[PDB]
Structure 1
Amino acid sequence: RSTLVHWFRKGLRLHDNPALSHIFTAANAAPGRYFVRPIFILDPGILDWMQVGANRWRFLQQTLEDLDNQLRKLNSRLFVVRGKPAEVFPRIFKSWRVEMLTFETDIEPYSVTRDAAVQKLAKAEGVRVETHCSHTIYNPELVIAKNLGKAPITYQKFLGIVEQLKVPKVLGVPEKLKNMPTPPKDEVEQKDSAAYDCPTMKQLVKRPEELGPNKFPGGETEALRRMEESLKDEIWVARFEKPNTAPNSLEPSTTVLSPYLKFGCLSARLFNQKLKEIIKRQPKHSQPPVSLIGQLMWREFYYTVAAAEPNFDRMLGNVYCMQIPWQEHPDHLEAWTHGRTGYPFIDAIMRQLRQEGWIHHLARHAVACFLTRGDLWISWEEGQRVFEQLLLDQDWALNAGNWMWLSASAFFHQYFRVYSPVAFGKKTDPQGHYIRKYVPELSKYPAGCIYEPWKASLVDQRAYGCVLGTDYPHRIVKHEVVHKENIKRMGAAYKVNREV
């Protein structure tokens, strides 16, 4: 008796999972011949390549637990194997007598490298590998091919290409396993009945004092519930315009499906279908790029450019990226990182990020503009790294793609348009309710100066119980001065990149 193995990495769902469904149908179409091991490998190597904050660890813990629970309802279970794939797979290929290995493809460089080696090993041991592109709606390889070898670098061109592509068929959940016994304990399982159990919170989250509120629980089950909840107002869905949603509403102004789509607890292809059904029902609706389908296409767009550039997350050796002289300033980077810049709007956002792990799209605009071309002149690679740690929806391609945009390094080139850290939030939150929440030490400043507390006289600062320089920092820079200087810096950079 040989085993069929589905390998989870992303695609942490049961629904719309061709690679997992295939394993399950195979076992039921040939009962008595196959054991079924759906695994997730706790890979220590990813930590040398990416940073993970406490809140995102918790999300994953919650995801794996839900995935295990959902697998049990199909007479299976999640096997969480600790260890490196390069050492894990030779062992289990033998100990398990693995006939077939399936998994969802991924375009990230670490994934590509790791997957190539696993496929070299699988080819040696005579293991059949079947891969599926289901993490995105479109296959970046096919998009690039259709565009004659190059990723479209504008959204409109990208849209014109995928319009001509076949939308894939969205699968349901696999059928339950018919008459399958529990796989026999292997070398590891016999010395430890729990060697493959889902990790506890204690095991994954080493810094639990950094956990913020539990608002967006992980797992395919919460993902589908949140999707259904977001689709209940079909008018809000059909008339969604992303630029008109607020960054600083106390309640999220968008769906906050990003963490779910990032881990694949929600199939983007299912989400897209559910959106097409509402658009069809609602004749007055928005169109890309501002619509919600448009939002999913921004995801697809950035996955496609990133599939073409292994260096997508850095400035050097990145085909798309303007080379800019970003300066090193540790102290300003620390202040930004910890929301101690002295600009209440920026600080409020960066504290919401660190506490909760999600901030609105245009709040990320604000704080990223400030770090890079706006104000501090600090490389976008540094904002990407802080974002990588803190974001529940951390996504190699989406994080890099949007930082290059916000920094006018690629895709976006109108660097003369600069967000004001004082003015930008006022449009949607003139009372500063968002600042009061996330910068509580300013909670007693009236609207007139809560965005600019340095316009309050010292006497009033003592009356509101927050003296700048003691209870809340002074501005680490003066926006009105640095942003003008930075525009000239950006113009010089653009000139140099144009002549090379």
Structure 2
Amino acid sequence: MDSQRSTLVHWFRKGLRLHDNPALSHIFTAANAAPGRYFVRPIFILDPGILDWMQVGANRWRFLQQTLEDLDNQLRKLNSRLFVVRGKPAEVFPRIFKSWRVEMLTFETDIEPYSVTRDAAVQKLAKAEGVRVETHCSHTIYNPELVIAKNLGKAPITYQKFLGIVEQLKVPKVLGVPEKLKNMPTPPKDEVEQKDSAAYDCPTMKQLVKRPEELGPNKFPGGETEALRRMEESLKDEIWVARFEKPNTAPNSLEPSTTVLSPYLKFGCLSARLFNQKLKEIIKRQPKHSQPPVSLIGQLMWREFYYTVAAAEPNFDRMLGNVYCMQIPWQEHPDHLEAWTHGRTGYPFIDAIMRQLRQEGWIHHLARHAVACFLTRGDLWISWEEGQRVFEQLLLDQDWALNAGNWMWLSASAFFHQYFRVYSPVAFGKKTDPQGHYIRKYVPELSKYPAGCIYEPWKASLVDQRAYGCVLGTDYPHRIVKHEVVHKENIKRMGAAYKVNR
């Protein structure tokens, strides 16, 4: 096979998987249809210039490193490989369109504003250069543009309305893995590979993680292979799956009470469409089962809902200019923001959650509720954008639409408006962890406190605090605010802001 004329490119960004990947599958099918004509290059473009951006924490870089290694491993089973191309797309694509004689480029669509801008520019260049582009909406179960169209041009702004719309939509088909490449030699080295054969090899941990001191325990390895193993593990207890009720899962069990598939769904290591289809099979054969919103399918529909409102608002992650967002006069509080950011608020439940987040990169949904309420309307009266920023740095599952949507909910800025309901930083965790095992783990300086005061260590006398080895103001901070006072003030501030907006 000396005969090749062109290269077929799949561009990974999200969609970091072989299964249920129509953009990738179509490349491999086209290659096999015309033996001898094509080379195939599945690529991921890594801009070294952002390895130092503090908004990507080490834990999330490590998850990507592991994911790319797995993706490359899996593509090798198809007689292909991953090509990790270092550079910026604005410079990479002109070069490789010419160098590789690219005939077709496929990718999975992404709704985030810079991605839309970037992809429109790649698409314009491709059209000019005669490159056929095919894009697929496989990151979400439904295409937000069809949802918005079915709703007469507006995104549904309640969960029940959204369910009412998507009930009327066809469910896109879930694909298997692509065909193994037949009769295809490896691509000839381009000018970059000619100088360094390894130029497109998967990055090492050292190449990707510039701040290894931020790494915590490796609890959730990256990659499709782990994503599928973890999904199958969650699905094997079919009664647990069928009867799942999200509000009844604990925020502070030591091991996660929910699936922790969110890092996998965020990177596309797991297809949400596959997972939806598997859940539907379970629900159909388990006559006793939960329903949306609280069921596991309901959780995937939460993700769908936020992707659809976000698709219609480029400013979804900001207060100003955001069609959904109440304008609320959040205050600047640098010292309180720093304390919340580092889990030094003096409320042990809140601090344990922020410390788990920083160390491990995942915290349960209702743990996110507790700390987000505390930062914003509940206690510190700081903008939800500041909380979004910190979550963006530390979460493995950092997701532009899901982070912004849930921060607006928790701050009573959109989608949720019952701001008289406020989480108690002392009482909320006790329902599910009365001994405080979660605090003893993540705030180890309090680990000797009796369970009767570990949520509220200021209730222990100085002599008791000394006996427990941890004196407030010396070994663990005093409360930075007093919840019982400030949350009442903030309920009045929320009332005022709601009036101004009305």
**Under a length normalisation based on structure 2, what TM-score does the superposition of the two structures give?**
0.98
Pick aligned residue for 2:245 from 237, 241, 247: 241
Report if the CA contact (8 A) 2:51-2:208 is conserved.
no
Cα displacement string for residues 343-395 of structure 1 (whole angstroms, at most 9, x for unaligned residues): 00000000000000000000000000000000000000000000000000000
Query: What is the CA–CA distance in structure 2 between the aligned matches of 1:65 and 1:118, rounded to whole Å?
Result: 26
Describe how 1:33-432 pairs up with structure 2 within 5 A: 33-44=37-48, 51-432=55-436
Structure 2 CA distance for partners of 1:49 and 1:316, relative to 1, 3 Å: farther
Query: What is the CA–CA distance in structure 2 between the aligned matches of 1:357 and 1:210, rounded to whole Å?
Result: 11
Cα displacement string for residues 186-231 of structure 1 (whole angstroms, at most 9, x for unaligned residues): 0111011111010100011000011000010000000000000000
Query: What is the CA–CA distance in structure 2 between the aligned matches of 1:9 and 1:257, rounded to whole Å?
Result: 18
Report if the CA contact (8 A) 1:50-1:388 is conserved.
no
Q: Following TM superposition, by how much is the alpha carbon of 1:168 offset from its aligned partner in structure 2, in angstroms?
A: 1.0
Q: Following TM superposition, by how much is the alpha carbon of 1:46 offset from its aligned partner in structure 2, in angstroms?
A: 6.3
Cα displacement string for residues 67-89 of structure 1 (whole angstroms, at most 9, x for unaligned residues): 00000010000000011101100
Report if the CA contact (8 A) 2:378-2:423 is conserved.
yes
Q: Mean alpha-carbon deviation: is it higher for 428-437 or for 39-48?
A: 39-48
Report if the CA contact (8 A) 1:341-1:347 is conserved.
yes
Structure 2 CA distance for partners of 1:353 and 1:436, relative to 1, 3 Å: same
Q: Following TM superposition, by how much is the alpha carbon of 1:51 offset from its aligned partner in structure 2, in angstroms?
A: 1.5
Q: Following TM superposition, by how much is the alpha carbon of 1:44 offset from its aligned partner in structure 2, in angstroms?
A: 5.0
Cα displacement string for residues 159-183 of structure 1 (whole angstroms, at most 9, x for unaligned residues): 0000010011110001110011010
Cα displacement string for residues 322-343 of structure 1 (whole angstroms, at most 9, x for unaligned residues): 0010000000000000000000
> Percent identity at matched positions?
100
Report if the CA contact (8 A) 1:5-1:38 is conserved.
yes
Q: Following TM superposition, by how much is the alpha carbon of 1:43 offset from its aligned partner in structure 2, in angstroms?
A: 2.9
Report if the CA contact (8 A) 2:79-2:181 is conserved.
yes
Cα displacement string for residues 377-421 of structure 1 (whole angstroms, at most 9, x for unaligned residues): 000000000000000000000000000000000000001100000
Q: Following TM superposition, by how much is the alpha carbon of 1:47 offset from its aligned partner in structure 2, in angstroms?
A: 7.0
Q: Following TM superposition, by how much is the alpha carbon of 1:48 offset from its aligned partner in structure 2, in angstroms?
A: 9.7
Report if the CA contact (8 A) 2:51-2:210 is conserved.
no
Report if the CA contact (8 A) 1:368-1:383 is conserved.
yes
- Counterpart in 1 of 2:472? 468
Query: What is the CA–CA distance in structure 2 between the aligned matches of 1:48 and 1:155, rounded to whole Å?
Result: 38
Cα displacement string for residues 21-67 of structure 1 (whole angstroms, at most 9, x for unaligned residues): 00000001111000000000013576799820000000000000000
Structure 2 CA distance for partners of 1:204 and 1:300, relative to 1, 3 Å: same
Q: Mean alpha-carbon deviation: is it higher for 377-386 or for 50-59?
A: 50-59
SS of the residue 1:153 aligns to? coil
Structure 2 CA distance for partners of 1:49 and 1:151, relative to 1, 3 Å: farther
Query: What is the CA–CA distance in structure 1 between the aligned matches of 2:159 and 2:279, rounded to whole Å?
Result: 19
Query: What is the CA–CA distance in structure 1 between the aligned matches of 2:194 and 2:239, rounded to whole Å?
Result: 56
Report if the CA contact (8 A) 2:10-2:107 is conserved.
yes
SS of the residue 2:299 aligns to? helix
Report if the CA contact (8 A) 2:51-2:209 is conserved.
no
Cα displacement string for residues 477-497 of structure 1 (whole angstroms, at most 9, x for unaligned residues): 100110000000000000000
SS of the residue 2:134 aligns to? strand
Query: What is the CA–CA distance in structure 1 between the aligned matches of 2:209 and 2:275, rounded to whole Å?
Result: 30
Cα displacement string for residues 428-450 of structure 1 (whole angstroms, at most 9, x for unaligned residues): 01110000000011011001000
SS of the residue 1:495 aligns to? helix
Structure 2 CA distance for partners of 1:47 and 1:315, relative to 1, 3 Å: farther
Structure 2 CA distance for partners of 1:416 and 1:271, relative to 1, 3 Å: same
Query: What is the CA–CA distance in structure 1 between the aligned matches of 2:468 and 2:299, rounded to whole Å?
Result: 41
Which runs of 4 or more aligned residues in structure 1 lie more than 6 Å from their structure 2 counterparts after TM superposition? Answer: 45-50
SS of the residue 1:35 aligns to? strand
Structure 2 CA distance for partners of 1:155 and 1:45, relative to 1, 3 Å: farther
Query: What is the CA–CA distance in structure 2 between the aligned matches of 1:18 and 1:183, rounded to whole Å?
Result: 22
Query: What is the CA–CA distance in structure 1 between the aligned matches of 2:200 and 2:48, rounded to whole Å?
Result: 15
SS of the residue 2:236 aligns to? coil
SS of the residue 2:323 aligns to? coil
Query: What is the CA–CA distance in structure 2 between the aligned matches of 1:333 and 1:63, rounded to whole Å?
Result: 33
Cα displacement string for residues 123-182 of structure 1 (whole angstroms, at most 9, x for unaligned residues): 110000000000000000000000000000000000000001001111000111001101
**Under a length normalisation based on structure 1, what TM-score does the superposition of the two structures give?**
0.99
Structure 2 CA distance for partners of 1:187 and 1:180, relative to 1, 3 Å: same
Query: What is the CA–CA distance in structure 2 between the aligned matches of 1:403 and 1:52, rounded to whole Å?
Result: 19
SS of the residue 2:406 aligns to? helix
Cα displacement string for residues 268-317 of structure 1 (whole angstroms, at most 9, x for unaligned residues): 00000000110011000000000000000000000000000000000000
Query: What is the CA–CA distance in structure 2 between the aligned matches of 1:351 and 1:268, rounded to whole Å?
Result: 29
Gapped regions of structure 2 (runs ≥ 5): none
SS of the residue 1:493 aligns to? helix
SS of the residue 2:85 aligns to? strand
Superposition RMSD on alpha carbons, in Å? 1.0
Gapped regions of structure 1 (runs ≥ 5): none
Q: Mean alpha-carbon deviation: is it higher for 27-36 or for 47-56?
A: 47-56
Query: What is the CA–CA distance in structure 2 between the aligned matches of 1:443 and 1:128, rounded to whole Å?
Result: 61
Residue-pair matches, total = 498
Structure 2 CA distance for partners of 1:331 and 1:44, relative to 1, 3 Å: same
Report if the CA contact (8 A) 1:249-1:429 is conserved.
yes
Query: What is the CA–CA distance in structure 2 between the aligned matches of 1:54 and 1:17, rounded to whole Å?
Result: 28
Query: What is the CA–CA distance in structure 2 between the aligned matches of 1:490 and 1:46, rounded to whole Å?
Result: 38
Query: What is the CA–CA distance in structure 2 between the aligned matches of 1:45 and 1:141, rounded to whole Å?
Result: 33
Report if the CA contact (8 A) 1:42-1:83 is conserved.
yes
Query: What is the CA–CA distance in structure 2 between the aligned matches of 1:187 and 1:315, rounded to whole Å?
Result: 47
Report if the CA contact (8 A) 1:20-1:102 is conserved.
yes
Query: What is the CA–CA distance in structure 1 between the aligned matches of 2:50 and 2:316, rounded to whole Å?
Result: 17
